[PDB]
Design a protein around this ligand. Sequence first.
Ligand SMILES: *[C@H](C)C1/C(=C/c2[nH]c(/C=C3N=C(/C=C4\NC(=O)C(CC)=C4C)C(C)=C\3CCC(=O)O)c(CCC(=O)O)c2C)NC(=O)C1C
Ligand SMILES: *[C@H](C)C1/C(=C/c2[nH]c(/C=C3N=C(/C=C4\NC(=O)C(CC)=C4C)C(C)=C\3CCC(=O)O)c(CCC(=O)O)c2C)NC(=O)C1C
Ligand SMILES: *[C@H](C)C1/C(=C/c2[nH]c(/C=C3N=C(/C=C4\NC(=O)C(CC)=C4C)C(C)=C\3CCC(=O)O)c(CCC(=O)O)c2C)NC(=O)C1C
Ligand SMILES: *[C@H](C)[C@H]1/C(=C/c2[nH]c(/C=C3N=C(/C=C4/NC(=O)C(CC)=C4C)C(C)=C\3CCC(=O)O)c(CCC(=O)O)c2C)NC(=O)[C@@H]1C
Ligand SMILES: *[C@H](C)[C@H]1/C(=C/c2[nH]c(/C=C3N=C(/C=C4/NC(=O)C(CC)=C4C)C(C)=C\3CCC(=O)O)c(CCC(=O)O)c2C)NC(=O)[C@@H]1C
Ligand SMILES: *[C@H](C)[C@H]1/C(=C/c2[nH]c(/C=C3N=C(/C=C4/NC(=O)C(CC)=C4C)C(C)=C\3CCC(=O)O)c(CCC(=O)O)c2C)NC(=O)[C@@H]1C
Ligand SMILES: *[C@H](C)[C@H]1/C(=C/c2[nH]c(/C=C3N=C(/C=C4\NC(=O)C(CC)=C4C)C(C)=C\3CCC(=O)O)c(CCC(=O)O)c2C)NC(=O)[C@@H]1C
Ligand SMILES: *[C@H](C)[C@H]1/C(=C/c2[nH]c(/C=C3N=C(/C=C4\NC(=O)C(CC)=C4C)C(C)=C\3CCC(=O)O)c(CCC(=O)O)c2C)NC(=O)[C@@H]1C
Ligand SMILES: *[C@H](C)[C@H]1/C(=C/c2[nH]c(/C=C3N=C(/C=C4\NC(=O)C(CC)=C4C)C(C)=C\3CCC(=O)O)c(CCC(=O)O)c2C)NC(=O)[C@@H]1C
Lengths: 172, 172, 172, 162, 162, 162
Amino acid sequence: MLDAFSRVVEQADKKGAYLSNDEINALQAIVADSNKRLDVVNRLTSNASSIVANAYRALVAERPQVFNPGGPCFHHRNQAACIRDLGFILRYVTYSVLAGDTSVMDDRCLNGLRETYQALGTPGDAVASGIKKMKEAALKIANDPNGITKGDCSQLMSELASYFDRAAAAVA
Amino acid sequence: MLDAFSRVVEQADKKGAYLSNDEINALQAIVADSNKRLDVVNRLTSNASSIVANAYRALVAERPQVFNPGGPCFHHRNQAACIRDLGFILRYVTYSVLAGDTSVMDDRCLNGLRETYQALGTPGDAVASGIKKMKEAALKIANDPNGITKGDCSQLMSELASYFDRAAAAVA
Amino acid sequence: MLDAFSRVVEQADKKGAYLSNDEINALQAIVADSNKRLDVVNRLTSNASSIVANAYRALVAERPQVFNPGGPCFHHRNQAACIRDLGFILRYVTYSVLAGDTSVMDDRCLNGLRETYQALGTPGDAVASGIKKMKEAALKIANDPNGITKGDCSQLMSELASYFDRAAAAVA
Amino acid sequence: MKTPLTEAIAAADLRGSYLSNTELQAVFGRFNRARAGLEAARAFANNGKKWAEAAANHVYQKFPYTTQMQGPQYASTPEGKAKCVRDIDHYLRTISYCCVVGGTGPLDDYVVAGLKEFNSALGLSPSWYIAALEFVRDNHGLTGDVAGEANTYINYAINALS
Amino acid sequence: MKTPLTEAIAAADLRGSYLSNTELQAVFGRFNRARAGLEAARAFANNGKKWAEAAANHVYQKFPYTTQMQGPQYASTPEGKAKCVRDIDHYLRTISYCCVVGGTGPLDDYVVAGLKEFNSALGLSPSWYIAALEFVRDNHGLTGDVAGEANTYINYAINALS
Amino acid sequence: MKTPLTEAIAAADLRGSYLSNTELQAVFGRFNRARAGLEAARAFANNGKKWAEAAANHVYQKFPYTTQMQGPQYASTPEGKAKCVRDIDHYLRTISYCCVVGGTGPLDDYVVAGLKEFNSALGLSPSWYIAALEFVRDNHGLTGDVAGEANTYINYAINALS
Ligand SMILES: *[C@H](C)C1/C(=C/c2[nH]c(/C=C3N=C(/C=C4\NC(=O)C(CC)=C4C)C(C)=C\3CCC(=O)O)c(CCC(=O)O)c2C)NC(=O)C1C
Ligand SMILES: *[C@H](C)C1/C(=C/c2[nH]c(/C=C3N=C(/C=C4\NC(=O)C(CC)=C4C)C(C)=C\3CCC(=O)O)c(CCC(=O)O)c2C)NC(=O)C1C
Ligand SMILES: *[C@H](C)C1/C(=C/c2[nH]c(/C=C3N=C(/C=C4\NC(=O)C(CC)=C4C)C(C)=C\3CCC(=O)O)c(CCC(=O)O)c2C)NC(=O)C1C
Ligand SMILES: *[C@H](C)[C@H]1/C(=C/c2[nH]c(/C=C3N=C(/C=C4/NC(=O)C(CC)=C4C)C(C)=C\3CCC(=O)O)c(CCC(=O)O)c2C)NC(=O)[C@@H]1C
Ligand SMILES: *[C@H](C)[C@H]1/C(=C/c2[nH]c(/C=C3N=C(/C=C4/NC(=O)C(CC)=C4C)C(C)=C\3CCC(=O)O)c(CCC(=O)O)c2C)NC(=O)[C@@H]1C
Ligand SMILES: *[C@H](C)[C@H]1/C(=C/c2[nH]c(/C=C3N=C(/C=C4/NC(=O)C(CC)=C4C)C(C)=C\3CCC(=O)O)c(CCC(=O)O)c2C)NC(=O)[C@@H]1C
Ligand SMILES: *[C@H](C)[C@H]1/C(=C/c2[nH]c(/C=C3N=C(/C=C4\NC(=O)C(CC)=C4C)C(C)=C\3CCC(=O)O)c(CCC(=O)O)c2C)NC(=O)[C@@H]1C
Ligand SMILES: *[C@H](C)[C@H]1/C(=C/c2[nH]c(/C=C3N=C(/C=C4\NC(=O)C(CC)=C4C)C(C)=C\3CCC(=O)O)c(CCC(=O)O)c2C)NC(=O)[C@@H]1C
Ligand SMILES: *[C@H](C)[C@H]1/C(=C/c2[nH]c(/C=C3N=C(/C=C4\NC(=O)C(CC)=C4C)C(C)=C\3CCC(=O)O)c(CCC(=O)O)c2C)NC(=O)[C@@H]1C
């Protein structure tokens, strides 16, 4: 497991040299917008349940075959196991926004998730569609003008988007 | 694990439709001859020890190289391990006649039994010969006229034969 | 696990014949020089720490890149893990001289050691160089004229050399 | 899945032996009640889709809010009603499987396993289904042992739903 | 397999270290008795096949039924007698291996491991073998330490057979 | 490795949930002291290589034997001195990483993990390094919170070294 800082430190040690001035300033920028970064991490945590529920609802509304008698995701056993999985992806996406790094998600989650769904007969292109919808919402919630100090938490959305997109690609 | 009934139910759910009338009658036939089916399962259970012992005796009488100094099955350690294995096959064959289904044998036993014997250096074509002899006896015992009500427990022998043949093929 | 004796016994059983006269004399030779064989096993055990320490020192003096910032063997974590590994090889080499057989080393150590170092990014050709140096010393120590009864513990050195060389080849 | 035959086999495989006399009777007595179970699953086969619409109407009168409130996960729209008749059918369809199998196997793996984690995560309520499931238990109107088998598994789903 | 050398190595590998002074002596003292063991295995090498027929006759007189009863697993037929001389030889052959190895390793893995599960599953009886094995223990007529090594492993097979 | 951010994530993954309010504050309060840590790692970046030669001389005066005795693992030869300035630098370099990370992660995995097993196996002594490490702790001469962060991790290496 690595974070935004511990990752640059690892890059500095591999060359046996201290963290350059330009690198000290880079992480310095990460700290400067930490408040915005935390608000992002906090708005996803709160609206966690809603995001994965609607992402599931829209996914079954887009692919009714998969969740019906015959499809891979039928039975209460599998129905609850699909929501749970989307919830997992969202949890690690949130972990990554906190750390400013995608390692936690890559190891603990994405690692062998492509082969897993494959060895179970899960569409994969259906899970990716569940993540892309789970993304649309996450951006709308995490970037709401009401209740927060006005500003431009821009580079957070772009980063948030890179995490979701990374997860969806890792299964499809 | 699945049985004669639970398997048709699984086929009905995969299409999201009830068990058709023609399917209700099919299993109805299975129940009608259950008494004969149980007698088969009970005569093999009783004469279990005899069947695997003679199957071993005839197999060593047909292949003396395998059970001598040099052959794969030498040493009391391996000698008892061969009988034990034949006993296993017979036990699951009996399980299948009870369930009217071959799933229990396919999973719990046949699953990776082909690779097992292979990774240990067991002839495979010798084990199959042990099962084919273990079959001849099983049919003679399970289908004896004395001590049982006269009738035609025919389709049971054919089924019994399909289980033994299935097991022998799965190793050779 | 097998030793010099138990290995010939295994060869005799595979043919279902007693140990021939010429084989009784062969092992008889092994017992005749056991005292020399034990002295070899005892001089390596004593000078164990020195051998692996100098082998490490010379190896870092021959390959400074590997043990510096960037190289595979940097960090106290990996630095101590390299000495420890050389120590392992030496321990099993000593075990083999005692048993007069190389089985213990082949199973407990060399088994999957080639793939291990590979899956971790260890040079392999560096470990082999550490063993070749660890050998030069082992021969000098185990074959010192002082403190021991004079004689010709020749075939022990040749055997000692075959064990070290076997280990080094098994990783490079 | 779960059935007295498959079950008796498992409890014998664990002991590393064949079936005991205490188990042989359990499997032998299964086939004795088997005819009633199949005839029960035959009843659902015919007038089973009919009980779906019948039970779908019952739940609406028990809980009026299910067909008037918003449109997130309620049977307000005609689209949501089609899902209510669908969901009830899945229950009746699975219950008939329990009659063929002679055990709560189907319900255990199909509807019970993962029941709550799903329902109480999508806004659906057990009371809606239990209500429309108790309806069928009375209105199915089966004979004797055929009605016995059907009820044993209809009420089972009610226990897990509560 | 099992031998004081291979054994002393295992008990050292577990500790993650070399041999202790308490073990070094155990291996050092092995080579001291090694000459008697090899000379014992040399005795079986020569007149070892002879003791097979000699012991095969002894068991017939001890248990007359072994050569008169039916033909399932008895030495009644001349074919079954060839297997009796064969089975006794396997015992003597393995016992000599224990002398070369200096431990009950061979007997442990070759004849002892799986002894009962096989015998008492094919109708064979231990009493037949023990009887013909006690015969050799007396009639082999070895010297001193050579006879000591041979007996230590001849009687061992008798302990496991009982 | 180890950092309040990476740590707070792990202690949340174990619970199979998101971050708690008790943890959210721990990560939120990390960024508050982050500026002092980075400025500390900035000090080592510049005059960090200088403290290496400065500390290398200090240890020689504390322990004269390190530069006069034999040549196995001492700084007697000019070659060994280059390794002493190198070894001290590795300590200072890693300590600055602890300031960027805001935790003893770097020291834990880089220098602490496997410290003793190596040193006390190659003849090197902790006292040499601790002495030259205590030197820097005083002579670095940093301001306030920048000096606080630097010292918290300079003395940490001293604790593990002892
Ligand atoms: C009828 C009592 C009422 C109606 C219920 C309702 N359910 C859904 C959505 C779903 N229903 C199921 C049912 C199952 N799937 C299974 O695999 C099994 C076990 C075999 C069951 C019982 C599922 C999986 C869903 C989710 C997928 C889907 O959207 O269909 C809806 C739709 C609302 C929504 O999408 O959340 C409705 C309306 N509603 C009522 O108010 C009833 C009284
Ligand atoms: C002699 C005491 C008498 C004779 C014994 C008898 N044994 C068998 C059959 C077998 N004997 C063995 C022996 C071994 N195989 C091994 O690997 C080992 C350990 C190294 C031993 C000791 C085995 C494996 C068999 C089974 C295979 C075979 O059929 O040869 C028979 C033949 C009867 C049968 O086939 O069951 C006999 C007659 N019988 C007596 O009555 C004796 C006194
Ligand atoms: C300076 C205090 C003095 C000097 C010390 C000294 N050390 C070595 C050899 C090594 N030093 C290290 C250091 C590290 N490698 C790492 O990965 C880490 C953690 C990041 C550290 C701290 C290592 C690995 C070695 C061994 C490899 C090598 O030979 O360089 C020497 C050389 C002597 C030898 O080869 O054994 C010396 C001289 N000596 C003193 O007396 C000092 C006061
Ligand atoms: C980006 C998604 C939106 C945005 C955010 C934004 N956030 C701040 C500053 C703060 N964020 C705080 C959040 C936390 N973290 C906690 O643990 C916690 C519990 C008390 C809170 C409230 C926080 C405390 C601050 C500082 C005080 C404040 O609320 O202003 C700011 C202002 C700039 C800054 O970095 O301080 C913004 C702009 N701004 C947007 O436009 C997006 C909608
Ligand atoms: C086919 C192998 C042979 C054959 C069998 C056959 N079996 C029956 C009927 C019964 N079988 C019973 C067996 C059991 N199961 C038990 O657990 C148990 C303990 C009490 C018993 C005795 C059984 C009770 C019956 C019914 C009573 C009876 O014995 O008749 C029948 C008759 C037809 C039927 O299905 O009932 C047959 C014919 N018939 C053959 O020809 C084969 C040799
Ligand atoms: C070969 C490396 C060198 C050599 C060795 C050599 N060794 C002996 C004989 C003995 N070795 C003994 C060693 C042990 N083992 C113990 O556990 C132990 C504790 C008491 C000791 C001392 C040992 C006891 C003997 C016998 C008595 C003795 O020391 O002489 C011999 C002599 C020939 C023989 O096999 O006995 C030699 C020559 N000789 C060399 O030239 C090599 C340097
Ligand atoms: C829902 C979006 C889609 C879907 C998902 C689905 N998942 C399973 C079962 C498993 N999912 C995983 C994956 C993980 N396990 C983990 O611990 C983590 C994070 C650490 C992940 C990502 C695993 C291992 C399983 C198997 C074990 C288990 O059940 O937990 C299923 C069931 C597959 C089946 O056929 O039984 C399904 C269906 N299914 C869909 O249709 C959606 C597209
Ligand atoms: C006898 C007919 C033949 C024969 C058999 C033989 N088997 C083994 C050892 C093993 N057999 C199995 C297979 C199973 N394990 C199970 O649990 C089950 C059912 C659930 C099966 C089918 C396994 C796993 C082993 C290895 C572990 C063990 O010993 O139990 C051997 C020994 C192989 C060796 O070389 O040591 C043998 C010989 N050998 C013959 O010659 C007959 C043809
Ligand atoms: C030193 C000569 C070289 C070197 C070695 C090195 N080893 C590791 C880590 C491992 N080594 C092993 C191998 C064994 N484990 C055993 O138990 C045995 C004997 C029974 C052996 C031979 C294993 C399994 C590991 C991994 C687990 C562990 O750490 O114990 C490393 C670390 C690799 C890394 O990148 O982290 C190294 C470096 N490295 C060198 O440069 C020398 C050539």
